[PDB]
Design a protein around this motif. Sequence first.
Motif, mmCIF file in Angstrom:
data_model
loop_
_atom_site.group_PDB
_atom_site.id
_atom_site.type_symbol
_atom_site.label_atom_id
_atom_site.label_comp_id
_atom_site.label_asym_id
_atom_site.label_seq_id
_atom_site.Cartn_x
_atom_site.Cartn_y
_atom_site.Cartn_z
ATOM 1 N N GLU B 143 0.858 -1.185 0.000
ATOM 2 C CA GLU B 143 0.000 0.000 0.000
ATOM 3 C C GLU B 143 0.889 1.227 0.000
ATOM 4 O OE1 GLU B 143 -3.307 -1.113 0.714
ATOM 5 O OE2 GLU B 143 -3.730 0.689 -0.504
ATOM 6 N N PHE B 144 1.809 1.235 0.966
ATOM 7 C CA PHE B 144 2.773 2.312 1.182
ATOM 8 C C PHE B 144 3.722 2.434 0.000
ATOM 9 C CE2 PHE B 144 7.177 3.277 2.509
ATOM 10 C CZ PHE B 144 7.041 4.536 3.030
ATOM 11 N N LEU B 145 4.381 1.325 -0.300
ATOM 12 C CA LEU B 145 5.327 1.239 -1.387
ATOM 13 C C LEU B 145 4.682 1.848 -2.630
ATOM 14 C CD1 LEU B 145 8.098 0.156 -1.557
ATOM 15 C CD2 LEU B 145 7.209 -2.064 -2.023
ATOM 16 N N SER B 146 3.405 1.544 -2.839
ATOM 17 C CA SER B 146 2.663 2.043 -3.989
ATOM 18 C C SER B 146 2.326 3.508 -3.884
ATOM 19 C CB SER B 146 1.372 1.255 -4.188
ATOM 20 O OG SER B 146 1.649 -0.051 -4.662
ATOM 21 N N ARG B 147 2.059 3.959 -2.665
ATOM 22 C CA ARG B 147 1.710 5.349 -2.434
ATOM 23 C C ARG B 147 2.934 6.264 -2.483
ATOM 24 N NH1 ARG B 147 -3.029 5.777 -1.494
ATOM 25 N NH2 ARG B 147 -2.950 3.609 -0.714
ATOM 26 N N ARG B 148 4.076 5.747 -2.019
ATOM 27 C CA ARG B 148 5.357 6.478 -1.994
ATOM 28 C C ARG B 148 6.087 6.581 -3.340
ATOM 29 N NH1 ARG B 148 7.206 10.173 0.186
ATOM 30 N NH2 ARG B 148 9.242 9.421 -0.565
ATOM 31 N N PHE B 149 5.958 5.566 -4.203
ATOM 32 C CA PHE B 149 6.656 5.580 -5.492
ATOM 33 C C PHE B 149 5.895 5.326 -6.795
ATOM 34 C CE2 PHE B 149 9.167 3.900 -2.022
ATOM 35 C CZ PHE B 149 10.070 4.910 -1.853
ATOM 36 N N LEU B 150 4.650 4.866 -6.744
ATOM 37 C CA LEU B 150 3.960 4.612 -8.002
ATOM 38 C C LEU B 150 2.805 5.551 -8.208
ATOM 39 C CD1 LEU B 150 3.736 0.734 -8.210
ATOM 40 C CD2 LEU B 150 5.719 2.065 -8.549
ATOM 41 N N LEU B 151 2.387 6.176 -7.120
ATOM 42 C CA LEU B 151 1.267 7.105 -7.152
ATOM 43 C C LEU B 151 1.543 8.401 -7.881
ATOM 44 C CD1 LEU B 151 -0.948 8.019 -4.137
ATOM 45 C CD2 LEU B 151 -1.106 8.987 -6.433
ATOM 46 N N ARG B 152 0.812 8.613 -8.962
ATOM 47 C CA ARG B 152 0.970 9.826 -9.745
ATOM 48 C C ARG B 152 0.693 11.091 -8.956
ATOM 49 N NH1 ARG B 152 -2.367 9.667 -14.874
ATOM 50 N NH2 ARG B 152 -0.449 8.742 -15.726
ATOM 51 N N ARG B 153 1.596 12.058 -9.077
ATOM 52 C CA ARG B 153 1.414 13.328 -8.406
ATOM 53 C C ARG B 153 1.030 14.344 -9.478
ATOM 54 N NH1 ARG B 153 2.911 11.399 -3.899
ATOM 55 N NH2 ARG B 153 4.672 9.918 -3.865
ATOM 56 N N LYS B 154 1.803 14.376 -10.551
ATOM 57 C CA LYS B 154 1.541 15.284 -11.658
ATOM 58 C C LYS B 154 1.708 14.382 -12.852
ATOM 59 C CE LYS B 154 1.530 18.708 -10.014
ATOM 60 N NZ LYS B 154 0.444 19.197 -9.102
ATOM 61 N N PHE B 155 0.747 14.403 -13.758
ATOM 62 C CA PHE B 155 0.822 13.542 -14.928
ATOM 63 C C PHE B 155 2.042 13.749 -15.803
ATOM 64 C CE2 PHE B 155 -1.192 11.313 -18.508
ATOM 65 C CZ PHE B 155 -0.621 11.945 -19.592
ATOM 66 N N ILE B 156 2.793 12.692 -16.007
ATOM 67 C CA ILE B 156 3.959 12.765 -16.851
ATOM 68 C C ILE B 156 3.547 12.082 -18.127
ATOM 69 C CG2 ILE B 156 6.207 11.881 -17.339
ATOM 70 C CD1 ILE B 156 6.438 11.290 -14.317
ATOM 71 N N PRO B 157 3.499 12.804 -19.237
ATOM 72 C CA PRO B 157 3.099 12.074 -20.429
ATOM 73 C C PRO B 157 4.274 11.335 -21.034
ATOM 74 C CG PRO B 157 3.390 14.311 -20.984
ATOM 75 C CD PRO B 157 3.517 14.248 -19.482
ATOM 76 N N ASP B 158 3.967 10.235 -21.728
ATOM 77 C CA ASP B 158 4.980 9.432 -22.410
ATOM 78 C C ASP B 158 5.510 10.257 -23.560
ATOM 79 O OD1 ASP B 158 6.321 7.113 -24.095
ATOM 80 O OD2 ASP B 158 4.810 7.978 -25.394
ATOM 81 N N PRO B 159 6.831 10.354 -23.642
ATOM 82 C CA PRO B 159 7.569 11.091 -24.650
ATOM 83 C C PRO B 159 7.467 10.489 -26.033
ATOM 84 C CG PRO B 159 9.026 9.693 -23.499
ATOM 85 C CD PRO B 159 7.746 9.671 -22.720
ATOM 86 N N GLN B 160 7.312 9.177 -26.146
ATOM 87 C CA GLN B 160 7.193 8.606 -27.481
ATOM 88 C C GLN B 160 5.966 9.112 -28.246
ATOM 89 O OE1 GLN B 160 9.025 5.840 -25.497
ATOM 90 N NE2 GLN B 160 9.469 4.374 -27.134
ATOM 91 N N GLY B 161 4.988 9.647 -27.522
ATOM 92 C CA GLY B 161 3.800 10.173 -28.166
ATOM 93 C C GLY B 161 2.719 9.135 -28.263
ATOM 94 N N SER B 395 -7.019 8.717 -30.280
ATOM 95 C CA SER B 395 -5.865 8.856 -31.144
ATOM 96 C C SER B 395 -5.153 10.157 -30.897
ATOM 97 C CB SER B 395 -6.287 8.790 -32.608
ATOM 98 O OG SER B 395 -6.602 7.466 -32.991
ATOM 99 N N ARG B 396 -5.854 11.110 -30.310
ATOM 100 C CA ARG B 396 -5.245 12.401 -30.056
ATOM 101 C C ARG B 396 -4.704 12.625 -28.656
ATOM 102 N NH1 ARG B 396 -6.273 15.887 -33.613
ATOM 103 N NH2 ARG B 396 -7.435 15.293 -35.526
ATOM 104 N N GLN B 397 -5.355 12.069 -27.643
ATOM 105 C CA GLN B 397 -4.883 12.262 -26.274
ATOM 106 C C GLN B 397 -3.696 11.377 -25.954
ATOM 107 O OE1 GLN B 397 -7.758 11.926 -23.108
ATOM 108 N NE2 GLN B 397 -6.139 12.514 -21.621
ATOM 109 N N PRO B 398 -2.691 11.928 -25.268
ATOM 110 C CA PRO B 398 -1.490 11.175 -24.908
ATOM 111 C C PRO B 398 -1.681 10.381 -23.656
ATOM 112 C CG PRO B 398 -1.127 13.568 -25.112
ATOM 113 C CD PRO B 398 -2.569 13.316 -24.823
ATOM 114 N N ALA B 399 -0.932 9.292 -23.573
ATOM 115 C CA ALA B 399 -0.943 8.402 -22.434
ATOM 116 C C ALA B 399 0.332 8.704 -21.664
ATOM 117 C CB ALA B 399 -0.945 6.980 -22.900
ATOM 118 N N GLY B 400 0.333 8.380 -20.381
ATOM 119 C CA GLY B 400 1.482 8.672 -19.551
ATOM 120 C C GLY B 400 2.683 7.796 -19.743
#
Lengths: 551, 551
Positions: B143-161, B395-400
């Motif tokens: 729960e913690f491990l997931s909250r401390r390191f996998l939980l999105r804070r600010k959306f980072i979009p995937d650079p590949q597009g 097709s237009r919206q980016p994924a993280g």
Amino acid sequence: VNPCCYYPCQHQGICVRFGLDRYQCDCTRTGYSGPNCTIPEIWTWLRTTLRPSPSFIHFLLTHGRWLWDFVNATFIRDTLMRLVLTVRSNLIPSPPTYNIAHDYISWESFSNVSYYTRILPSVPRDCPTPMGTKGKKQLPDAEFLSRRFLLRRKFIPDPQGTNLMFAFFAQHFTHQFFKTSGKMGPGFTKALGHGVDLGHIYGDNLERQYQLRLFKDGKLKYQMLNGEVYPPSVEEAPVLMHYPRGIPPQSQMAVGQEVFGLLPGLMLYATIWLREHNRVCDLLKAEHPTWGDEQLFQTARLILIGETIKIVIEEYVQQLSGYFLQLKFDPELLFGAQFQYRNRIAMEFNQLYHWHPLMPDSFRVGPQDYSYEQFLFNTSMLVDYGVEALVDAFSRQPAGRIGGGRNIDHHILHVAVDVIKESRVLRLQPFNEYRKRFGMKPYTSFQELTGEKEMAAELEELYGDIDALEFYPGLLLEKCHPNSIFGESMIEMGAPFSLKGLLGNPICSPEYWKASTFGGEVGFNLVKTATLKKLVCLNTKTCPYVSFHVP
Amino acid sequence: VNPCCYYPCQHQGICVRFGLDRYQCDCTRTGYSGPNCTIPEIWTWLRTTLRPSPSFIHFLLTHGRWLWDFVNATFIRDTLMRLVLTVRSNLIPSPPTYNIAHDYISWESFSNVSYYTRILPSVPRDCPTPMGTKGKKQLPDAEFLSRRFLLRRKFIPDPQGTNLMFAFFAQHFTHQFFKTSGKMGPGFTKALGHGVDLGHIYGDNLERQYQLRLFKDGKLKYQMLNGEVYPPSVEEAPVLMHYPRGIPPQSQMAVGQEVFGLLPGLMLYATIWLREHNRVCDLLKAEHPTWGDEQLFQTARLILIGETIKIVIEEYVQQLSGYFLQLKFDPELLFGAQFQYRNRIAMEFNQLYHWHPLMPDSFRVGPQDYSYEQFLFNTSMLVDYGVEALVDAFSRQPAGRIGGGRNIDHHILHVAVDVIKESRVLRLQPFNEYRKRFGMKPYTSFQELTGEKEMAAELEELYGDIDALEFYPGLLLEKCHPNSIFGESMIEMGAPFSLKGLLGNPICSPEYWKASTFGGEVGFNLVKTATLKKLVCLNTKTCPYVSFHVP
Ligand code: HEM
Ligand code: HEM
Ligand SMILES: *[C@@H]1O[C@H](CO)[C@@H](O[C@@H]2O[C@H](CO)[C@@H](O)[C@H](O)[C@H]2NC(C)=O)[C@H](O)[C@H]1NC(C)=O
Ligand SMILES: *[C@@H]1O[C@H](CO)[C@@H](O[C@@H]2O[C@H](CO)[C@@H](O)[C@H](O)[C@H]2NC(C)=O)[C@H](O)[C@H]1NC(C)=O
Ligand SMILES: CCCCCCCCO[C@@H]1O[C@H](CO)[C@@H](O)[C@H](O)[C@H]1O
Ligand SMILES: CCCCCCCCO[C@@H]1O[C@H](CO)[C@@H](O)[C@H](O)[C@H]1O
Ligand SMILES: *[C@@H]1O[C@H](CO)[C@@H](O)[C@H](O)[C@H]1NC(C)=O
Ligand SMILES: *[C@@H]1O[C@H](CO)[C@@H](O)[C@H](O)[C@H]1NC(C)=O
Ligand SMILES: *[C@@H]1O[C@H](CO)[C@@H](O)[C@H](O)[C@H]1NC(C)=O
Ligand SMILES: *[C@@H]1O[C@H](CO)[C@@H](O)[C@H](O)[C@H]1NC(C)=O
Ligand SMILES: O=C(O)c1ccccc1O
Ligand SMILES: O=C(O)c1ccccc1O
């Protein structure tokens, strides 16, 4: 008229119908081009023009003991052994192709393993005759056909010297992959293993296995009678068996292959192999004190599968082939080839393995000569006599010639009648077509098929065209190789089915053929050094004459 | 202490325990000799000393567009494409090896396909720590491990597009072989196909197929809404689906993958592919007027499987890899190799494919921006908007970004928590071990794994040893390749699982890769020429922007 009925496409081309009429042959990777896949490629033509007659090859493989002995002792053995393996295996397709349900490739045919596959698609139900284009509009009455040409008149023994030990082995063995579904119809099998999974020992389904399992040291449940080990009682291990109504649980042996319950021959071997699995467990336990039930069980089964494949190739197939080249089981001879370690049971291969003519006129157990009426369900002969005893007996009495004709004992003649009928339901293509498919040239007359003029003449009036002679009758009624248990087609069509189904087992793959798979060099050697003799004798208080060849 | 806990055997040697203590490594065909399979063979050493860094290779495959363009146009493409195929595929074992039930090869593991297989045997339940020899005696609270390191804070979009069209594709697609059995426990799967059988369209069992089947021209049942084709209603085709209680049959779409019912994204694709299968049937019927339902159905399914594998390799994998080399689907590049056309789903490969970070913060369908609360079970968005519409949107919206860390939207964060837990039940070995197994060198510090010092420092206090960092967290928390959707291990461990599971389908075998398998050159080309764009656009009244890459 369905054009594909004319079997237009040659050399494995695929007949595909198009439009109402029309059809097209798919000669992809066939070796031939053309509208019917008949125009060879230079290499293909060149290859076939030199291909020496199967007959010739057979001749060589059966003469010059002297020359062969040298060869068996050189590297040339492996060389050939490998070659045989590869070239033989190529006729059988992998992945599997069609089934009773589809004369096309379909995901469902590739996935649904309750189906027996086939090499040749059925004779289309829209053809003018029951075989396609030729022959009578109605086929010979099986009962008759069987009574006129397969019914034994005077016992002809097999010249190779094949005895009962082999007859029963072959029976028991083939009853682990030939297990047609009663309630599902022909073309459906209950043995979902499609190969040597030793399922007739451990059960064809998990529940049944757990039933026969002791769950201690990886052993299989058993019982003591006369201070000797036999399978457990249906009472002890409540599994489903087939015993005529009136035989009590307490008097029935639970075993893995429901049917095996009726014929001391079967139960004889079933006892040896049980005894074996238990013994191997003890070995494993020595090395691996830290091991658990399953680990032991599972590992033992892997070892026996190994034993089984060795005895089958080096002793069994050897005998049956009469070759002078010493066959060898070494899954590494294939590590270089492009082989697919997977196998699926062919309906054709099931027919072909109906070697009922091996069965004798009477079963002689020493001074005692028993009748089918005393053999067929005798729930005591085994316990009475004992493993060693019966083994010696079966090892001494000869089995009949398989091919040849009129050599099936009347007690089981019905079986062959049923085989003929079943074939027809499967709409199996003609013998001559299969002749081609497996590399041979089709017979041009009934007189050429059989070695004689008499019955060849009747078959002619019966069938009407050699091009209408059916699969099984054609196999059983073809002329036998000089002093062989059968003829050309049996070998040329059976061997591939056999060898692909032997090497195409996951344990022969480079992935599993590690000594760790068998629990270490110990288990490994058991596999690498098995003997029919070692099999019986290590599990019996006394070693008798044991051999597939009558003394 | 179980010696195998120390993971003694190197380079794929097998640790076998012996005696109470003792153990032996099986280095059969390992490439190394020695007690722990550490002493290489000349060729092996020579081979590894020249093996260029996976990182380097990646670099090359992603630069020099110019140089690559030339190459993509020469034969060198196929050359490489084949090489990739072979060398990649070798890490995955065939036949399969162990399962949740056996850290040994057992016939049962090879036969019972309800089991997900694994590449690396479990960390023995008798080891001192939950990972073997190192780390804390208790692992970080998921729960913690997931909250401390996998939980999105600010959306980072995937650079590949990578956009949503790809996110949903990947989801829907992988949900045909990742289908863990609820009632059976982790490590058990309901998808007995273990690959691309297109079972999420036709149903994972025969009965269910027959349900979705129309039984006319080989078509799949469907319904018209706004004069457009959508799947049928659960009322129409009474199949089992998963819709929150209160949603009526008449309002539920029957489809093949029970779960797909909740997320217009899934149902969107499910509609396209249905539409497709029906269209192909019509084609087949033209050519084969003489054809029957099944023949048509079965054949259509074979073609789609073809389409699916093409789009997956040439468009999907291309995007996801960012390679400049143009990947190619040509099952003939393998006709020379020793490849086994069979595949079995790895539990590890399932974990690895938990790319939940792709999912956005909100789903924008034009001016409209929907919430998870409006997306998650909306039984009307699809019909409302229409295929074309939603396609354009996704097709237009980016994924993280997938790898990287702290990029999983809280709405589905639980999933990742569960993944961690499930892993432990499976007793999955440590990330570093897998690093090795798939050709990589293990991380020597948390700071090396992650690109930074901060969270690398916390993971350190949490886990205690990089040699104790778990599989999934290690995959998600490792530093991303320059401008990549993820890092090294994802590719180096995922690609083999992926490519073996793509070419190891019976249709890629030389046996089935005949144009007759697909109904003739027609069906065949459909396979040989598929496009994500063709897929949507041929089944829609109007072609929108369609692509895995955001415009
Ligand atoms: C006392 C001797 C034997 C008896 C009483 C016997 C009888 C039968 C019977 C009745 C069937 C079922 C089909 C039907 O209803 O006719 C069967 C099938 C078969 N038998 Fe035997 N058989 C004997 C020996 C053998 C031997 C020696 C072999 C091995 C060559 C053999 C091979 C087969 C095969 C492969 C099948 C097909 C099984 C299946 O598909 O399920 N039989 N046998
Ligand atoms: C709206 C977005 C999505 C939701 C709500 C979601 C949720 C879930 C849930 C709940 C599970 C079951 C395990 C649990 O109880 O936590 C699951 C499993 C999984 N998801 Fe998703 N997911 C989404 C998107 C994705 C995507 C985009 C992919 C593809 C990368 C994906 C891949 C997986 C995989 C492979 C599994 C394992 C399935 C199995 O083994 O049965 N999910 N997902
Ligand atoms: C394997 O194929 C057979 C035939 O297609 C399937 O058996 C039939 O399946 C249908 C649908 O369940 C039933 O109407 C029949 O009664 C079934 N029995 C027989 C003897 O035909 C069988 O279900 C298939 N098995 C799998 C796992 O797909
Ligand atoms: C595949 O393996 C699993 C586990 O060995 C089998 O499932 C269990 O089988 C035993 C015996 O029938 C039961 O006591 C359990 O309740 C079964 N279910 C589970 C979830 O463990 C399964 O039967 C095997 N399938 C086959 C075809 O062998
Ligand atoms: C002494 C020479 C040994 C050669 C072993 C080859 C194994 C037999 O090979 C067989 O030969 C037949 C006749 O050519 C072909 O019809 C069969 O397809 C093939 O399997
Ligand atoms: C431009 C050169 C293209 C070569 C394509 C080879 C495909 C990548 O191959 C991969 O390389 C890794 C690093 O060596 C290994 O760890 C992997 O096992 C292997 O699959
Ligand atoms: C192809 O086979 C059919 C059927 O046997 C035959 O009628 C036709 O003439 C053949 N064509 C050629 C070119 O061999
Ligand atoms: C069974 O075989 C035994 C010998 O093992 C014999 O004495 C007995 O009469 C046989 N019983 C039947 C019913 O044939
Ligand atoms: C083999 O591995 C074990 C465990 O890692 C180690 O203790 C032992 O020293 C190793 N032996 C050699 C020769 O590498
Ligand atoms: C479902 O989506 C539609 C648009 O397709 C929207 O108008 C509606 O409010 C949504 N319903 C829910 C419950 O979110
Ligand atoms: O190799 C063969 O020719 C052969 C023939 C008959 C039976 C088994 C065989 O291996
Ligand atoms: O070939 C690859 O490197 C690869 C990497 C990621 C995904 C699919 C792939 O084929």
